[PDB]
Amino acid sequence: GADSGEIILFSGSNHADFKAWGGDDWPSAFEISPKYEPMKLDLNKNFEIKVDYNGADIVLIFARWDKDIWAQISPYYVVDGTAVFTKEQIAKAYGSDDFSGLDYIAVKPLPSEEGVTVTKVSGIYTNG
């Protein structure tokens, strides 16, 4: 499997604060509702997603409401501020590698004092 990228999915500065569950909501530093917004990454291909962030530990979420799936994973690794999540890790947490009907993709901070800032989300095709 030969790689190609990156494909920029977000660039800018989004900050989210979050200190504990139980509350109003659990905000995202980046999120996409794929039935309503173009997803520039083909999830049927093999891929990984990279997130440049500063601050809180983060998780990546893929969710599908009607099947009650909430696949939540930590990065495989983080290096100099860039977290990487593989399609293998997301498929394992989701219970399938078939993301038809996906409703939600989000990068969320776990609890922290400072919150998280996300400055880039990208994809790399790692084959298909």
Backbone as CSV, one residue per row, in Angstrom:
resi,resn,N_x,N_y,N_z,CA_x,CA_y,CA_z,C_x,C_y,C_z
1,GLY,0.786,-1.260,0.000,0.000,0.000,0.000,0.814,1.305,0.000
2,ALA,0.813,2.051,-1.115,1.591,3.265,-1.302,0.724,4.464,-0.793
3,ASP,1.368,5.424,-0.153,0.664,6.571,0.441,0.581,7.760,-0.551
4,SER,-0.490,8.586,-0.434,-0.491,9.888,-1.136,-1.145,10.960,-0.250
5,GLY,-0.581,12.167,-0.179,-1.233,13.294,0.627,-0.188,14.335,0.989
6,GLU,-0.527,15.252,1.850,-1.801,15.160,2.575,-2.947,15.840,1.833
7,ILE,-4.138,15.476,2.219,-5.369,16.134,1.781,-5.898,16.983,2.949
8,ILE,-5.887,18.303,2.811,-6.278,19.149,3.960,-7.826,19.122,4.135
9,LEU,-8.313,18.736,5.340,-9.743,18.661,5.664,-10.154,19.918,6.489
10,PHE,-9.178,20.520,7.198,-9.372,21.749,8.018,-8.028,22.389,8.217
11,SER,-8.015,23.732,8.133,-6.869,24.447,8.607,-7.346,25.781,9.185
12,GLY,-6.773,26.224,10.293,-7.280,27.448,10.966,-6.897,27.283,12.417
13,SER,-7.752,27.747,13.310,-7.495,27.608,14.758,-8.844,27.437,15.420
14,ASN,-9.171,26.217,15.878,-10.419,26.056,16.609,-10.072,25.640,18.027
15,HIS,-10.631,26.299,19.017,-10.388,25.942,20.403,-11.619,25.468,21.086
16,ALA,-11.496,24.379,21.871,-12.634,23.881,22.663,-12.116,23.632,24.073
17,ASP,-12.952,23.990,25.038,-12.688,23.753,26.491,-13.558,22.672,26.998
18,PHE,-13.070,21.845,27.911,-13.906,20.772,28.436,-13.170,20.230,29.656
19,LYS,-13.855,20.203,30.804,-13.224,19.754,32.031,-13.812,18.544,32.671
20,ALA,-15.058,18.184,32.372,-15.674,16.943,32.948,-16.993,16.664,32.279
21,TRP,-17.345,15.403,32.247,-18.605,14.955,31.772,-19.719,15.275,32.774
22,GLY,-20.956,15.257,32.316,-22.138,15.280,33.161,-22.911,16.506,32.789
23,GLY,-22.318,17.345,31.970,-22.779,18.704,31.809,-23.588,18.959,30.581
24,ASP,-23.591,20.241,30.220,-24.237,20.742,29.002,-23.935,19.830,27.806
25,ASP,-22.672,19.883,27.396,-22.288,19.209,26.221,-20.789,18.945,26.305
26,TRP,-20.323,18.218,25.326,-18.929,17.840,25.191,-18.543,18.403,23.854
27,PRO,-17.886,19.544,23.861,-17.699,20.226,22.530,-16.683,19.549,21.676
28,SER,-16.708,19.847,20.355,-15.662,19.364,19.418,-14.764,20.497,19.013
29,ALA,-13.474,20.191,18.773,-12.596,21.187,18.149,-12.763,21.130,16.634
30,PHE,-13.202,20.018,16.088,-13.496,19.918,14.680,-14.599,18.859,14.563
31,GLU,-15.581,19.106,13.732,-16.566,18.006,13.435,-17.213,18.172,12.053
32,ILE,-17.678,17.047,11.498,-18.306,16.987,10.171,-19.526,16.100,10.333
33,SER,-20.668,16.542,9.731,-21.844,15.655,9.607,-21.875,15.214,8.125
34,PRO,-21.395,13.999,7.813,-21.160,13.694,6.368,-22.436,13.629,5.499
35,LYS,-23.621,13.430,6.090,-24.834,13.517,5.224,-25.134,14.933,4.780
36,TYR,-24.504,15.921,5.383,-24.844,17.343,5.141,-23.683,18.174,4.638
37,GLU,-22.456,17.625,4.717,-21.243,18.432,4.409,-20.358,17.512,3.623
38,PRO,-19.696,18.033,2.572,-18.754,17.214,1.739,-17.598,16.668,2.611
39,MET,-17.259,15.396,2.404,-16.145,14.747,3.078,-15.124,14.526,1.991
40,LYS,-14.046,15.308,1.973,-13.007,15.301,0.910,-12.120,14.040,0.917
41,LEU,-12.310,13.171,1.891,-11.571,11.927,2.025,-12.522,10.782,1.694
42,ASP,-12.108,9.909,0.811,-12.881,8.730,0.503,-12.670,7.644,1.540
43,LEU,-13.649,7.431,2.430,-13.442,6.454,3.577,-13.517,5.020,3.098
44,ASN,-13.821,4.769,1.814,-13.779,3.392,1.334,-12.378,2.972,0.996
45,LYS,-11.507,3.954,0.775,-10.098,3.715,0.585,-9.397,3.513,1.913
46,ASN,-8.219,2.899,1.915,-7.434,2.871,3.157,-6.904,4.272,3.434
47,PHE,-6.859,4.698,4.702,-6.477,6.128,5.009,-5.978,6.200,6.473
48,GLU,-5.350,7.332,6.789,-5.222,7.719,8.178,-5.578,9.201,8.225
49,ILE,-5.927,9.664,9.435,-6.271,11.057,9.668,-5.269,11.644,10.623
50,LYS,-4.745,12.848,10.325,-3.722,13.474,11.149,-4.311,14.727,11.679
51,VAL,-4.052,14.995,12.976,-4.582,16.248,13.603,-3.458,16.993,14.299
52,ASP,-3.204,18.268,13.902,-2.237,19.063,14.633,-3.017,19.739,15.737
53,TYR,-2.546,19.568,16.982,-3.319,20.166,18.142,-2.302,20.581,19.182
54,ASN,-2.788,21.372,20.148,-2.006,21.887,21.271,-2.958,21.810,22.477
55,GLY,-2.493,21.292,23.611,-3.395,21.338,24.813,-3.814,19.937,25.216
56,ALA,-5.099,19.767,25.447,-5.698,18.499,25.930,-5.417,17.309,25.050
57,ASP,-5.313,16.134,25.664,-5.459,14.913,24.858,-6.744,14.893,24.053
58,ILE,-6.719,14.258,22.883,-7.940,14.274,22.031,-8.370,12.894,21.659
59,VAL,-9.635,12.743,21.248,-10.092,11.516,20.699,-10.732,11.791,19.325
60,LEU,-10.771,10.777,18.477,-11.501,10.856,17.220,-12.742,9.983,17.381
61,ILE,-13.866,10.501,16.975,-15.166,9.811,17.042,-15.753,9.607,15.639
62,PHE,-16.175,8.373,15.330,-17.087,8.131,14.182,-18.357,7.554,14.794
63,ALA,-19.512,8.099,14.385,-20.804,7.650,14.999,-21.883,7.523,13.966
64,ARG,-22.792,6.571,14.255,-23.927,6.363,13.347,-25.104,6.198,14.323
65,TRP,-26.054,7.119,14.225,-27.122,7.193,15.267,-28.029,6.053,15.212
66,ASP,-28.524,5.724,14.035,-29.576,4.691,13.963,-29.116,3.254,14.375
67,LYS,-27.831,2.994,14.438,-27.295,1.722,14.894,-26.590,1.859,16.247
68,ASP,-26.705,3.001,16.856,-26.092,3.261,18.112,-24.635,2.975,18.186
69,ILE,-23.942,3.376,17.156,-22.482,3.196,17.156,-21.820,4.507,17.513
70,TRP,-20.893,4.460,18.460,-20.077,5.619,18.868,-18.685,5.057,19.006
71,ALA,-17.882,5.216,17.938,-16.528,4.602,17.901,-15.586,5.709,18.349
72,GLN,-14.871,5.569,19.461,-14.115,6.620,20.031,-12.699,6.080,20.253
73,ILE,-11.712,6.746,19.662,-10.371,6.182,19.807,-9.384,7.290,20.089
74,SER,-8.314,6.902,20.767,-7.158,7.759,20.984,-6.209,7.570,19.746
75,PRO,-5.310,8.486,19.535,-4.357,8.332,18.389,-3.443,7.109,18.575
76,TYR,-3.035,6.522,17.446,-2.037,5.457,17.518,-0.748,6.030,18.082
77,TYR,-0.359,7.271,17.715,0.811,7.950,18.247,0.584,9.435,18.034
78,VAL,1.417,10.200,18.726,1.513,11.666,18.607,2.976,12.089,18.468
79,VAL,3.308,12.935,17.490,4.737,13.289,17.361,4.748,14.768,17.058
80,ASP,5.494,15.523,17.868,5.646,16.977,17.728,4.284,17.624,17.424
81,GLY,3.300,17.263,18.223,2.024,17.969,18.122,1.063,17.461,17.065
82,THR,1.395,16.351,16.393,0.503,15.802,15.382,0.055,14.423,15.798
83,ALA,-1.238,14.263,15.993,-1.816,12.962,16.354,-2.187,12.229,15.073
84,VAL,-1.958,10.908,15.028,-2.396,10.099,13.855,-3.362,8.980,14.253
85,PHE,-4.448,8.829,13.504,-5.466,7.827,13.725,-5.547,7.042,12.455
86,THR,-5.525,5.706,12.524,-5.600,4.888,11.305,-7.022,4.398,10.999
87,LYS,-7.314,4.097,9.733,-8.609,3.485,9.434,-8.753,2.124,10.142
88,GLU,-7.661,1.395,10.324,-7.727,0.124,11.068,-8.245,0.381,12.502
89,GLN,-7.725,1.422,13.152,-8.132,1.645,14.574,-9.629,2.011,14.591
90,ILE,-10.057,2.870,13.653,-11.458,3.383,13.621,-12.396,2.218,13.269
91,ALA,-11.989,1.329,12.324,-12.857,0.199,11.958,-13.047,-0.800,13.113
92,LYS,-11.985,-0.953,13.901,-12.030,-1.877,15.028,-13.060,-1.333,16.084
93,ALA,-12.970,-0.018,16.378,-13.879,0.620,17.345,-15.320,0.712,16.804
94,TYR,-15.475,0.817,15.485,-16.811,1.002,14.844,-17.546,-0.328,14.671
95,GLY,-16.757,-1.389,14.584,-17.236,-2.791,14.355,-17.387,-3.167,12.898
96,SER,-16.931,-2.296,12.002,-16.980,-2.596,10.578,-15.971,-1.667,9.906
97,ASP,-15.512,-2.062,8.732,-14.798,-1.054,7.941,-15.654,-0.379,6.868
98,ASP,-16.958,-0.632,6.941,-17.916,-0.071,6.023,-18.627,1.091,6.698
99,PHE,-18.320,2.302,6.252,-18.819,3.497,6.946,-20.058,4.044,6.250
100,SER,-20.715,3.216,5.411,-21.981,3.724,4.832,-22.920,4.182,5.949
101,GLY,-23.566,5.318,5.714,-24.573,5.761,6.627,-23.972,6.491,7.813
102,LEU,-22.631,6.673,7.895,-22.047,7.450,8.955,-22.714,8.811,9.128
103,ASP,-22.949,9.145,10.391,-23.514,10.454,10.714,-22.621,11.535,11.210
104,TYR,-21.504,11.166,11.793,-20.754,12.128,12.566,-19.281,11.732,12.661
105,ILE,-18.402,12.694,12.402,-16.984,12.499,12.662,-16.572,13.723,13.519
106,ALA,-15.849,13.546,14.637,-15.466,14.680,15.474,-14.124,14.419,16.124
107,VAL,-13.364,15.492,16.335,-12.145,15.469,17.172,-12.578,16.238,18.428
108,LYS,-12.531,15.607,19.613,-13.003,16.178,20.893,-11.857,16.174,21.864
109,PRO,-11.765,17.185,22.742,-10.757,17.151,23.841,-11.243,16.285,25.001
110,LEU,-10.273,15.543,25.528,-10.606,14.957,26.852,-10.335,16.002,27.917
111,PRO,-10.853,15.694,29.186,-10.825,16.720,30.240,-9.499,17.284,30.428
112,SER,-9.419,18.593,30.605,-8.146,19.241,30.916,-8.364,20.645,31.435
113,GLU,-7.319,21.224,32.000,-7.387,22.599,32.462,-7.426,23.597,31.340
114,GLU,-6.673,23.334,30.292,-6.383,24.334,29.257,-7.278,24.226,28.000
115,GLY,-7.926,23.097,27.822,-8.685,22.817,26.637,-7.719,22.432,25.471
116,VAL,-8.295,22.359,24.257,-7.458,21.977,23.103,-7.571,23.043,22.014
117,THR,-6.493,23.267,21.267,-6.641,24.014,19.997,-6.247,23.120,18.821
118,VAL,-7.056,23.054,17.782,-6.728,22.213,16.609,-6.433,23.227,15.467
119,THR,-5.312,23.005,14.783,-4.867,23.952,13.709,-4.881,23.281,12.333
120,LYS,-5.004,21.933,12.255,-5.069,21.295,10.921,-5.661,19.924,11.163
121,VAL,-6.505,19.448,10.241,-6.913,18.058,10.169,-6.638,17.692,8.706
122,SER,-5.963,16.588,8.495,-5.707,16.155,7.100,-5.944,14.644,6.987
123,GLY,-5.961,14.155,5.732,-6.016,12.719,5.485,-4.855,12.289,4.567
124,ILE,-4.519,10.989,4.639,-3.539,10.484,3.730,-4.175,9.205,3.287
125,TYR,-4.140,8.940,1.977,-4.581,7.656,1.453,-3.336,6.728,1.574
126,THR,-3.548,5.454,2.039,-2.392,4.613,2.550,-2.495,3.314,1.770
127,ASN,-3.512,3.418,0.918,-3.895,2.707,-0.282,-5.428,2.700,-0.287
128,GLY,-6.120,1.607,-0.658,-7.560,1.589,-0.747,-8.010,0.136,-0.658
